[PDB]
Amino acid sequence: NQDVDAAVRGILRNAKLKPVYDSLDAVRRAALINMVFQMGETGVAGFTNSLRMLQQKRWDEAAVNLAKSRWYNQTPNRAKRVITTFRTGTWDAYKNLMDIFEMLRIDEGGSSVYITVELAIAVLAILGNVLVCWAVWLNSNLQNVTNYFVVSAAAADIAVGVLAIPFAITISTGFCAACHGCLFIACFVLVLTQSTIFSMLAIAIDRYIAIRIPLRYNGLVTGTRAKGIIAICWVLSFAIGLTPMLGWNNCGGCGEGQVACLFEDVVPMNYMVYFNFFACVLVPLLLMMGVYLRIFLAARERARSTLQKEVHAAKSLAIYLGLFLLCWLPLHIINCFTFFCPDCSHAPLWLMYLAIVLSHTNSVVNPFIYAYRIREFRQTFRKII
Ligand SMILES: CCNC(=O)[C@H]1O[C@@H](n2cnc3c(N)nc(NCCc4ccc(CCC(=O)O)cc4)nc32)[C@H](O)[C@@H]1O
């Protein structure tokens, strides 16, 4: 409030800023005030090229140059909102959750509907996946090797419902927390959601061998081997989700040492796109889908029944993996747009939240559906109920 007035007087004192300020529109002037307030009149005066684009009323040109700055790479979401305001002369960027004071209030630091749906998913997750584990633990006939993978996926999903989703809610509200404390929480969410994905792929591996190599399934994927695969998945989940803590983070209003706990403010975007999305979601998945497609296309009295059962299994499996991608993709596509196009306006609150909701629904119901379609599971469910 007091610093706002001082920032404007700082602009007036520097001959490199004052003429550029006068040239700006009422709204664009506030964007400059925000920028100066943040890094100082000397810092902003170092933007000789972008200042000349603003002075020449080349708005979109100024946006391009500002988005290439050290400023943008330091705090890209705040820089993006200031840049959008400089380009359009509107508060489009500040539409969710007008004057320079309110702009600074937002940057320094619907929601109820999001939290409600998120907790509804958390509850459903726990109930459904615990039921699945009870069926296998109670009913002796369900304690086979395949169900080691089913139960493993289910258990991970229970932990997602209890911990990960509540933590993900925190991560999107922006309360003031120590930067590294907020980084740890984000990593914990990344580990548990990573585990879901890997567990479903482990299930896919098990089924693939069971339908394509039925003559060696018992003699190839043992209880021991299965436990090994599951352990490996968890090792990878921790390794990946905790990677940011090893150095790949964004921090190498309310108080010193505390920051607004927001996912994108502490977790790097190149990490999420290049490493997490492409290598730990897309390639693993698409490869598995491709395998199923080839088994299906190759496939297409007792020798006949044995084949029809594998053509059906191939279609069912393809549909499951397709659904998985349809729910995980929206979120990662939004992330890609934000990362590849720094000039572009950020996705709106309702859209970002919608994508998160979708991904979390899939992250908890993958095991249950598979189990519900099995006759032995369904009847056992009723007997518990
Ligand atoms: C297996 C990998 N795990 C994941 O994908 C998990 O991470 C989380 N997540 C993956 N991207 C993201 C992501 N961009 N933002 C968030 N929250 C914060 C939402 C948010 C961001 C920016 C703004 C500013 C808007 C503006 O300037 O006008 C507002 C809200 N969580 C993610 C999900 O919970 C998923 O389950």
Residue numbers in the entry: 1035 to 1131, 1138 to 1149, 5 to 147, 158 to 205, 219 to 303
What does the paper say about this structure?
Beginning with the adenosine A2A receptor (A2AR) scaffold, we designed membrane receptors with varying signalling activity and thermostability.
We selected our most stable variants and screened for potent agonists and fusion proteins at the N terminus of the receptor to achieve maximal expression and apparent agonist-bound stability. In close agreement with the design models, a highly signalling-active designed receptor crystallized in an atypical GPCR active-like conformation despite the absence of a bound G protein. While the moderate 3.9 Å resolution prevented the unambiguous assignment of electron density to solvent molecules, the ligand agonist and most side-chain conformations could be readily characterized. While the orientation of TMH6 was unique among GPCR active forms, TMH7 adopted a canonical active-state conformation. We found that the contacts mostly involved the T4 lysozyme (T4L) fusion domain on the extracellular part of the receptor, and to a lesser extent TMH5 and the intracellular loop (ICL) 2. The intracellular tips of TMHs 6 and 7 or ICL3 that strongly determine the active-like conformation of the receptor are not engaged in crystal packing contacts. The root mean squared deviation (RMSD) between the experimental structure and the design model was only 1.5 Å over the entire TM region and was reduced to 1.2 Å when the two helical turns of TMH6 contacting Gs were excluded.
